Amino acid sequence: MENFQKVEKIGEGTYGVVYKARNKLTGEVVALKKIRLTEGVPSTAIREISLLKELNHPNIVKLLDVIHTENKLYLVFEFLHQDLKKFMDASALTGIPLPLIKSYLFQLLQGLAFCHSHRVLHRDLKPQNLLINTEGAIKLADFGLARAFGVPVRTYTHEVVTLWYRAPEILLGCKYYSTAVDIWSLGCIFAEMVTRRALFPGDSEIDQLFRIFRTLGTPDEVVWPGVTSMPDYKPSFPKWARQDFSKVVPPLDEDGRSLLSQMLHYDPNKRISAKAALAHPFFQDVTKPVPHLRL
Ligand SMILES: CCC(C)(C)[C@H]1CCc2n[nH]c(C(=O)NC)c2C1
């Protein structure tokens, strides 16, 4: 772009670099993602992304514009001041207060209920693409399209993609993702906010898969019909017994643990939907606290 002045690099996104930029004309502060395209223009991929501009909801970071020019694809996002990853790190000694964790989870599920009702999947939810503001809101950002740009083994910067929040069906090679993959990721995020430690910190696809198995038990046809016929399932997978759930997220009350267990069901069909999750008793006393943010 030429109508933008970089303020600082927000990071090396999954497709390109992201800068905090000022719209030299409007004075608007935005998050600008630059995706390098090499020759064959991704018309399909480009149209999918563009439709995301109509996806407007209080818990979704607004995609202001999508500019394809000079073999580059620019995504202009509304700017929020901090991501959940940084907030979680900054809250590591004291932990995020439960009422705030609950508020964040509730809002994220409202956001997912919204995109899912519009047939939009995120596919790569993680603390890094969950953005928060001073008023207590948290918003989903950077919806992916495995249906197009697939899933680059490594972001444009040769950087390692995090597998910690990946649903088991994706790891087992399912060709078709369902909205259930986002519920799984959010469940993992919820656990992390609660314990202050990643639930399944795998450093490889198989390690990711096995860490899940070690905690939730190796899945079989009883809990997950069809699992043994999945593309990457191997009858040789070690058979781990399911761990007592009270050991998984200790500080969490029973309502929180029951909701989490439902978000982490192996069978995508048994996994709770965002809509049903919003009705869970865990949210009976949900409120909207203000986070203490250091910007
Ligand atoms: C790949 C796009 C990512 C990096 C997730 C951006 C999505 C949109 C966005 N808006 N603000 C921020 C921000 O980080 N602020 C401090 C972001 C992050």
Curated annotation (Swiss-Prot):
Domain Protein kinase: 4-283
Root EC class: transferase
Modified residues (Phosphotyrosine): 15, 19
Reaction catalysed by this enzyme: L-seryl-[protein] + ATP = O-phospho-L-seryl-[protein] + ADP + H(+); L-threonyl-[protein] + ATP = O-phospho-L-threonyl-[protein] + ADP + H(+)
Activity regulation as described: Phosphorylation at Thr-14 or Tyr-15 inactivates the enzyme, while phosphorylation at Thr-157 activates it.
Residues the entry annotates as binding Mg(2+): 129, 142
InterPro entries: CDK, Kinase-like_dom_sf, Prot_kinase_dom, Protein_kinase_ATP_BS, Ser/Thr_kinase_AS
Binding site for ATP: 10-18, 33, 78-80, 83, 126-129, 142
Cofactor(s) it depends on: Mg(2+)
Cofactor note: Binds 2 Mg(2+) ions.
GO cellular component labels: Cajal body; centrosome; chromosome, telomeric region; condensed chromosome; cyclin A1-CDK2 complex; cyclin A2-CDK2 complex; cyclin E1-CDK2 complex; cyclin E2-CDK2 complex
Keywords: Acetylation, ATP-binding, Cell cycle, Cell division, Cytoplasm, Cytoskeleton, DNA damage, DNA repair, Endosome, Kinase, Magnesium, Meiosis, Metal-binding, Mitosis, Nucleotide-binding, Nucleus, Phosphoprotein, S-nitrosylation, Serine/threonine-protein kinase, Transferase
Induction: Induced transiently by TGFB1 at an early phase of TGFB1-mediated apoptosis.
Outcome when changing residue 14 to A: 2-fold increase in activity
Sequence positions bearing Phosphothreonine: 14, 157
Modified residues (N-acetylmethionine): 1
Known EC number: 2.7.11.22
Oligomer status and interactors: Found in a complex with CABLES1, CCNA1 and CCNE1. Interacts with CABLES1. Interacts with UHRF2. Part of a complex consisting of UHRF2, CDK2 and CCNE1. Interacts with the Speedy/Ringo proteins SPDYA and SPDYC. Interaction with SPDYA promotes kinase activation via a conformation change that alleviates obstruction of the substrate-binding cleft by the T-loop. Found in a complex with both SPDYA and CDKN1B/KIP1. Binds to RB1 and CDK7.
Function: Serine/threonine-protein kinase involved in the control of the cell cycle; essential for meiosis, but dispensable for mitosis. Phosphorylates CABLES1, CTNNB1, CDK2AP2, ERCC6, NBN, USP37, p53/TP53, NPM1, CDK7, RB1, BRCA2, MYC, NPAT, EZH2. Triggers duplication of centrosomes and DNA.
Family: Belongs to the protein kinase superfamily. CMGC Ser/Thr protein kinase family. CDC2/CDKX subfamily.
PANTHER family assigned: CELL DIVISION PROTEIN KINASE (PTHR24056), CYCLIN-DEPENDENT KINASE 2 (PTHR24056:SF521)
Protein name: Cyclin-dependent kinase 2
UniProt source species: Homo sapiens
Organism placement in taxonomy: Eukaryota, Metazoa, Chordata, Craniata, Vertebrata
The encoding gene: CDK2
